[PDB]
Short mmCIF file of C-alpha atoms and ligand atoms in Angstrom, two decimals:
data_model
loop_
_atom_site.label_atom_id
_atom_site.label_comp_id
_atom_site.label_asym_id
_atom_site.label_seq_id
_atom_site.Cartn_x
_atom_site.Cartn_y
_atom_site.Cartn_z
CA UNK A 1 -41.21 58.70 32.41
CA UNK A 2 -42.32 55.22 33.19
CA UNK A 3 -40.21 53.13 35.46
CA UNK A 4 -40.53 49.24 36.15
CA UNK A 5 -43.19 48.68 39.22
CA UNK A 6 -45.13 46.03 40.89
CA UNK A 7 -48.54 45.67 41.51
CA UNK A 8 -50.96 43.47 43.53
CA UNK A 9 -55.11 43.98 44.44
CA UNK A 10 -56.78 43.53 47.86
CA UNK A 11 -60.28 43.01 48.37
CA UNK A 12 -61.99 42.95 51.63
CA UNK A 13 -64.94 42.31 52.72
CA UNK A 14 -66.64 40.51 56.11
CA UNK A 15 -65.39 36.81 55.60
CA UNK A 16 -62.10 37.61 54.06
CA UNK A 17 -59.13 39.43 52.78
CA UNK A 18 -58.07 38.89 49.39
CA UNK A 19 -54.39 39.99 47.96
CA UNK A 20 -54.09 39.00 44.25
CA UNK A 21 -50.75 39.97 42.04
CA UNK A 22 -51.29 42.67 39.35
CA UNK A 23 -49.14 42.96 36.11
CA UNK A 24 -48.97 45.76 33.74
CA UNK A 25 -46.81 48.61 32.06
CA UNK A 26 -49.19 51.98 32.83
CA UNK A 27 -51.96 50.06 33.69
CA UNK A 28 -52.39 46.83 35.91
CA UNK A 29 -54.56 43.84 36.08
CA UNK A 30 -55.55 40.75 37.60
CA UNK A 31 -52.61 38.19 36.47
CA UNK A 32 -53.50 34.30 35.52
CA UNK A 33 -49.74 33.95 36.55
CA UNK A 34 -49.66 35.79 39.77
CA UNK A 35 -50.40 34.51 43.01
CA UNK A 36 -53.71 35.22 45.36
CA UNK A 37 -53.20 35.06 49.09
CA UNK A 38 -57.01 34.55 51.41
CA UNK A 39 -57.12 35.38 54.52
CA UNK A 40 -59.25 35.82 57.36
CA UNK A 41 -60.00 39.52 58.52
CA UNK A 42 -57.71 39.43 61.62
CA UNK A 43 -54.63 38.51 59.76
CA UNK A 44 -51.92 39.59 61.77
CA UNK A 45 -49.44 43.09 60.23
CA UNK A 46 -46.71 40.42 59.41
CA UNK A 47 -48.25 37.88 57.71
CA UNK A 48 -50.63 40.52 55.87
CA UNK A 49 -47.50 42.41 54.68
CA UNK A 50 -45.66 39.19 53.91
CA UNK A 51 -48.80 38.42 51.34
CA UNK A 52 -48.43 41.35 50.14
CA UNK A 53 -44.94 40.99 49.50
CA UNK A 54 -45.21 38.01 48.06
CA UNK A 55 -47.71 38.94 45.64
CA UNK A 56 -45.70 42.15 44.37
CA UNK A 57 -42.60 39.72 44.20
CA UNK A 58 -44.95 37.48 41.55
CA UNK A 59 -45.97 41.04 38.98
CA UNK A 60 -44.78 41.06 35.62
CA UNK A 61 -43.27 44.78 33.95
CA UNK A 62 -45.06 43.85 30.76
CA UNK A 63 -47.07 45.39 27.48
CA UNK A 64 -49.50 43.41 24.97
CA UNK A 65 -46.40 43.55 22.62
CA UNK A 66 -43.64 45.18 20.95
CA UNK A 67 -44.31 48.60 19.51
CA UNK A 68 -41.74 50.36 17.32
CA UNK A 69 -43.44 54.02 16.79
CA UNK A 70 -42.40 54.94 20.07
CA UNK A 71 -40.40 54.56 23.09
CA UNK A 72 -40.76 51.75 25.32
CA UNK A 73 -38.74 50.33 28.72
CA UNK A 74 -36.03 48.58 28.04
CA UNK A 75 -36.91 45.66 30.63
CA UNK A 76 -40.51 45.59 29.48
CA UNK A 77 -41.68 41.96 28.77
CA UNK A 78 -44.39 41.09 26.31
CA UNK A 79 -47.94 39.18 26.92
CA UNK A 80 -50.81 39.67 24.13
CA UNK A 81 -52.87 37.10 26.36
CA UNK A 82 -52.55 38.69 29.64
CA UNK A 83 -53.98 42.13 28.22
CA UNK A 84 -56.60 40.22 26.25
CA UNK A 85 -60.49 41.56 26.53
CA UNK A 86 -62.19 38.13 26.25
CA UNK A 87 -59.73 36.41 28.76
CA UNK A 88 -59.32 39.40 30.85
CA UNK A 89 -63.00 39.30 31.41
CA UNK A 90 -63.30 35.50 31.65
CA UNK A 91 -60.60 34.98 34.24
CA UNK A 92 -62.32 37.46 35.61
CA UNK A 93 -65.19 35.95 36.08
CA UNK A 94 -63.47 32.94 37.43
CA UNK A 95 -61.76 34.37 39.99
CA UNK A 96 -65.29 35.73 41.01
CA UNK A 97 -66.84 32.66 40.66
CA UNK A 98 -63.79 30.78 43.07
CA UNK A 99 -64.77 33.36 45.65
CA UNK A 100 -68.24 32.24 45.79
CA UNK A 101 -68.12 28.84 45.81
CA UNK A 102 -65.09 28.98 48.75
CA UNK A 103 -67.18 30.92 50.88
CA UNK A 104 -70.99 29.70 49.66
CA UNK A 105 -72.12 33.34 48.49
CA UNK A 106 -74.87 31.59 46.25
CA UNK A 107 -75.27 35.27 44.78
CA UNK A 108 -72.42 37.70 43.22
CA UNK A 109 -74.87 40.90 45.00
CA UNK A 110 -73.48 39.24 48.70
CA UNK A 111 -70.08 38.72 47.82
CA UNK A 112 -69.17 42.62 46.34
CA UNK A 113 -71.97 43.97 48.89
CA UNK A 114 -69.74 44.58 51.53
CA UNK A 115 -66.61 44.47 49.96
CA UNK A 116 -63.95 47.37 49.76
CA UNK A 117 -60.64 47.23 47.19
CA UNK A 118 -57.04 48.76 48.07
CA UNK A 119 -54.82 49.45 45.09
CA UNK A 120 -50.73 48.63 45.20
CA UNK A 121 -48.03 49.63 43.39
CA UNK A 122 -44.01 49.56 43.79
CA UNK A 123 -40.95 50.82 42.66
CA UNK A 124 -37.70 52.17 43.61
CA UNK A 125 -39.35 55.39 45.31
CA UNK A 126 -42.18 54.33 47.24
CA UNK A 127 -44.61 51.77 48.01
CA UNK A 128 -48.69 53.24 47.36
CA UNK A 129 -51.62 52.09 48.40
CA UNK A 130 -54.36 53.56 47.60
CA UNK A 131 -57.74 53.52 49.13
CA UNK A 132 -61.00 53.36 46.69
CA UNK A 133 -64.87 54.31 46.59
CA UNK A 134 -67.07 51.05 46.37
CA UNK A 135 -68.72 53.23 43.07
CA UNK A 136 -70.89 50.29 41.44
CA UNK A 137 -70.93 46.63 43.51
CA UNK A 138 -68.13 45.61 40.48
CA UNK A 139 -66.95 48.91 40.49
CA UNK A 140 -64.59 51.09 42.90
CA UNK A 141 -62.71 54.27 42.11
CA UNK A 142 -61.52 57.70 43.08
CA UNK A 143 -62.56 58.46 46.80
CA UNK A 144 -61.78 61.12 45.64
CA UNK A 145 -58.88 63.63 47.32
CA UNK A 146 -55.94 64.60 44.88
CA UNK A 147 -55.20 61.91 46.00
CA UNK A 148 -53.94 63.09 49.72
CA UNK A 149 -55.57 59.59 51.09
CA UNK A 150 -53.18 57.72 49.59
CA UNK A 151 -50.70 55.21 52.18
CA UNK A 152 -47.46 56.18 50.97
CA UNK A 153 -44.86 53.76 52.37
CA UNK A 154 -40.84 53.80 51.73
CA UNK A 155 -39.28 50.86 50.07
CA UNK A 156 -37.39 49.72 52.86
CA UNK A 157 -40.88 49.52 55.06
CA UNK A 158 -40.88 45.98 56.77
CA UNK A 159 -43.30 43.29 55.99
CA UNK A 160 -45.38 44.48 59.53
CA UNK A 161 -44.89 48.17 58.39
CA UNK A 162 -46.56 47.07 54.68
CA UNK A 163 -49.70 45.28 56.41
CA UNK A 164 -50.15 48.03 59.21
CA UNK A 165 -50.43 50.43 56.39
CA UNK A 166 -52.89 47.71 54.26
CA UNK A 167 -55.27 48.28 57.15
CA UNK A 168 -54.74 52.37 57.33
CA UNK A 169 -55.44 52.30 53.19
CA UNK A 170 -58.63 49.86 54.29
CA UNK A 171 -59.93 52.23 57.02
CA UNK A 172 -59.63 54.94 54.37
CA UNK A 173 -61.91 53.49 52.40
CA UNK A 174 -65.20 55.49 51.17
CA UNK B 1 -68.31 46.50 12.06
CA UNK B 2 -69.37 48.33 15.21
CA UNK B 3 -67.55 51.43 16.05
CA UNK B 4 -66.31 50.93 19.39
CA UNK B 5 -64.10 48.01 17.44
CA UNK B 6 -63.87 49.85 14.19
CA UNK B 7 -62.08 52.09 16.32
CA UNK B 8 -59.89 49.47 17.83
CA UNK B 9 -58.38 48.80 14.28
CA UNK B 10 -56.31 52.36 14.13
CA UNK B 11 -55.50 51.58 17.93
CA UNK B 12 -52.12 49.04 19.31
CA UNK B 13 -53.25 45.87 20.35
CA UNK B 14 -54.08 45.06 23.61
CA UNK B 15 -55.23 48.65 24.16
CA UNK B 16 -59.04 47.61 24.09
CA UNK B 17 -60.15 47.44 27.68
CA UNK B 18 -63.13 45.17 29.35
CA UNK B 19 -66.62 46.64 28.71
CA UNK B 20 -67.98 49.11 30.62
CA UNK B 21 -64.93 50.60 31.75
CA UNK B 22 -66.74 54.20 32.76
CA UNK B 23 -66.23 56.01 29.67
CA UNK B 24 -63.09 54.69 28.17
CA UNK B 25 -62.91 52.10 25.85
CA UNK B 26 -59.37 52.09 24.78
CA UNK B 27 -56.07 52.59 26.47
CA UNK B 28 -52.80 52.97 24.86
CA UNK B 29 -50.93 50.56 27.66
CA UNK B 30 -47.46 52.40 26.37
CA UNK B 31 -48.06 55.53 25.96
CA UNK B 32 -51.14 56.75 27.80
CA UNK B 33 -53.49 57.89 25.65
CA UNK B 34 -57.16 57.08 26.69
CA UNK B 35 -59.91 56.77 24.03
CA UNK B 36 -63.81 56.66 24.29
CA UNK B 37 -65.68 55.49 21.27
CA UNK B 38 -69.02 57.25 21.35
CA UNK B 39 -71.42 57.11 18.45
CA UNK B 40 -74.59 58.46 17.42
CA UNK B 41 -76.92 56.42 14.55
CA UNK B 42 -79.47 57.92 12.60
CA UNK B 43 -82.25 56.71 14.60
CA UNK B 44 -81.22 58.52 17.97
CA UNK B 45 -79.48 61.56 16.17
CA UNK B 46 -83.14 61.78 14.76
CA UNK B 47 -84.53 61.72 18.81
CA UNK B 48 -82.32 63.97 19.73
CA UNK B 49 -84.27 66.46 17.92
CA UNK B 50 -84.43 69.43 20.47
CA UNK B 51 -82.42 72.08 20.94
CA UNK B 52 -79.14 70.99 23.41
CA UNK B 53 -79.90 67.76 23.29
CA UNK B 54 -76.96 66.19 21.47
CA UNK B 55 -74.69 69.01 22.60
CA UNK B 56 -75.85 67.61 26.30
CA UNK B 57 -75.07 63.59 25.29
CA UNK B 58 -71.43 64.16 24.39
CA UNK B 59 -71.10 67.02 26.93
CA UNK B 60 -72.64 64.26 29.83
CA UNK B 61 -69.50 61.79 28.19
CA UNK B 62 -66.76 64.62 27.65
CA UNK B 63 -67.82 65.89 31.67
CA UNK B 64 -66.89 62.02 32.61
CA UNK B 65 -63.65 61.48 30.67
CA UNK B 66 -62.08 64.66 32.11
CA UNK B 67 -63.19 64.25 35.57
CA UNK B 68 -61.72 60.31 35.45
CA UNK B 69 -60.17 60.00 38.54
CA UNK B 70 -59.30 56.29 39.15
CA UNK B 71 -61.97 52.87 37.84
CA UNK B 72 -61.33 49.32 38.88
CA UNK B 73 -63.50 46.99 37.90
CA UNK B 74 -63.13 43.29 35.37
CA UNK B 75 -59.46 42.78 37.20
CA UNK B 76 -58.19 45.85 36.13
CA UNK B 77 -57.36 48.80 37.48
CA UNK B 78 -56.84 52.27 35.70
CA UNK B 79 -56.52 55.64 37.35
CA UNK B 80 -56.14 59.65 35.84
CA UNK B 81 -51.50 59.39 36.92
CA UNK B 82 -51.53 56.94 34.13
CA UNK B 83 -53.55 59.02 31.56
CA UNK B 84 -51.32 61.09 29.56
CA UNK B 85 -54.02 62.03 27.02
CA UNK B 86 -57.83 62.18 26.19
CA UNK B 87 -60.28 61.66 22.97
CA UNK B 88 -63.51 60.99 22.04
CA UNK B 89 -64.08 59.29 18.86
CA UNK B 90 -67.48 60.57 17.80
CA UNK B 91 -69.05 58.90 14.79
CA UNK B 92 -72.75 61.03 13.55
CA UNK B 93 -74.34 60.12 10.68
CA UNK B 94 -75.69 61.38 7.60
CA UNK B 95 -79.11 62.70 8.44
CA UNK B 96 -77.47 65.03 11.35
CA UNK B 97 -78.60 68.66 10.64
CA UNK B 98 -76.63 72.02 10.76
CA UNK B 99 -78.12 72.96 14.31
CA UNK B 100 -77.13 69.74 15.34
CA UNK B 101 -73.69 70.09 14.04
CA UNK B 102 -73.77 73.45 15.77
CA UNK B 103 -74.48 71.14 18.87
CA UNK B 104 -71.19 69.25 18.19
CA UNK B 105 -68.34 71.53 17.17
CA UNK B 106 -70.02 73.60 20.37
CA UNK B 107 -69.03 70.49 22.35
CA UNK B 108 -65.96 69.71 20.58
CA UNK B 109 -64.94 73.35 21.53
CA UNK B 110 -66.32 72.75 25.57
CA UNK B 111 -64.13 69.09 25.50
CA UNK B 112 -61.24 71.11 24.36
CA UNK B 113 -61.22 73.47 27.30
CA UNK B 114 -62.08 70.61 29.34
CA UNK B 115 -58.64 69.10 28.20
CA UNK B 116 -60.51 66.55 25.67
CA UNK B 117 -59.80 66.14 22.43
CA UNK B 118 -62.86 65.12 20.06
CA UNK B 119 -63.15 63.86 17.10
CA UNK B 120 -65.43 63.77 14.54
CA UNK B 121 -66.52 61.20 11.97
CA UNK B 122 -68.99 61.48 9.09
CA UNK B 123 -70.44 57.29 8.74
CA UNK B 124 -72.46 56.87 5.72
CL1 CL C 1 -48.57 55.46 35.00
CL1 CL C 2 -69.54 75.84 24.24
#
């Protein structure tokens, strides 16, 4: 059922776009190892798509650790810290804290204000991005179709193709 | 120990997820299987004293654990294509009357229906 994928976050707001690598198995999360790629809002398609890239190049097909009562991926790799509560929530807080400081925010209300978040995931069928609603100011979710606003991209799409539908998934935003 | 990480000790590790995550408080990162730790102590089983009122408080969480359609929030991101299954671990305690327990096996039945499985346990 589950196949090996890739994962990365974007978060956008007026100042900035953000593209951070996500790791996981079902689900995926911020990753201490991946990369993070700012840019200003008027990035152009290739370079936007390139960061993209090159975030999804830097996720990790991995579990909190080995489990024996049922079946698991045979290239699954293992990372007990990564899936963490207390550092999940602390790095976290961290990479909130970077953001504010960078750009001055003085106040976490003014940085997630006007900010939207873009979901992607890889694998051998398609690339996804999906668009979210800004729910809570720290919390976005389903926009919610079934889930017929997703940007569905092949693999072969090229870097401008991958950042031309970042900004589709972005204008789709709720 | 509390029961949101009593329930944590039957569960694989790394399944607990950051607080606040809607309604779910565990996820089985393998396998699928969501799981939200809801519990009622005597002092608010005791306040929910009128008819439909606990009946409505796990009904309100059951309504949001089957209509989970995608959360990201704390770095993480978790939507309903990666949910293969769904419980409620309900802990009531000792002073919970019949018509209350009426109130619960009437919402274990509605969660069931609603494709949620929950689950009931006595805490002295
Ligand atoms: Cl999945
Ligand atoms: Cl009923």
């Amino acid at each position: 059922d589950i196949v090996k994928s890739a994962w990365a976050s974007v978060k956008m707001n007026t100042d900035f776009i953000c593209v951070d690598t996500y790791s996981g198995y079902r689900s995926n999360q911020l990753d201490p190892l991946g990369v993070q790629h700012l840019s200003s809002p008027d990035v152009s398609d290739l370079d936007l798509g390139e960061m993209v890239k090159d975030a999804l190049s830097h996720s990790r097909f991995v579990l909190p650790a080995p489990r024996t009562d049922i079946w698991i991926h045979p290239e699954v790799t293992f990372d007990l810290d990564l899936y963490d509560s207390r550092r999940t929530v602390e790095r976290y807080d961290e990479w909130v804290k970077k953001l504010m400081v960078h750009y001055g925010y003085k106040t976490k209300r003014a940085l997630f204000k006007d900010m939207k978040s873009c979901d992607i995931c890889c694998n051998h069928d398609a690339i996804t991005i999906s668009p979210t609603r800004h729910e809570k100011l720290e919390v976005w979710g389903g926009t919610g179709l079934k889930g017929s606003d997703n940007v569905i991209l092949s693999v072969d799409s090229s870097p401008t193709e991958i950042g031309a539908g970042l900004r589709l998934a972005l204008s789709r935003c709720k | 120990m509390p029961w949101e990480d009593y329930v944590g000790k039957t569960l694989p590790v790394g399944s607990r997820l950051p607080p606040n995550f809607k309604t779910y408080d565990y996820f089985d990162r393998a396998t699928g299987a969501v799981v939200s730790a809801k519990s009622l102590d005597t002092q608010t089983m005791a306040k929910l004293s009128n008819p439909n009122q606990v009946y409505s408080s796990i009904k309100k969480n059951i309504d949001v654990t089957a209509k989970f359609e995608k959360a990201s929030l704390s770095g993480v991101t978790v939507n309903s294509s990666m949910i293969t299954s769904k419980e409620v671990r309900l802990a009531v305690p000792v002073n919970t009357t019949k018509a209350q327990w009426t109130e619960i096996n009437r919402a274990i039945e509605y969660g069931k229906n609603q494709g949620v499985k929950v689950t009931v346990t006595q805490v002295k």
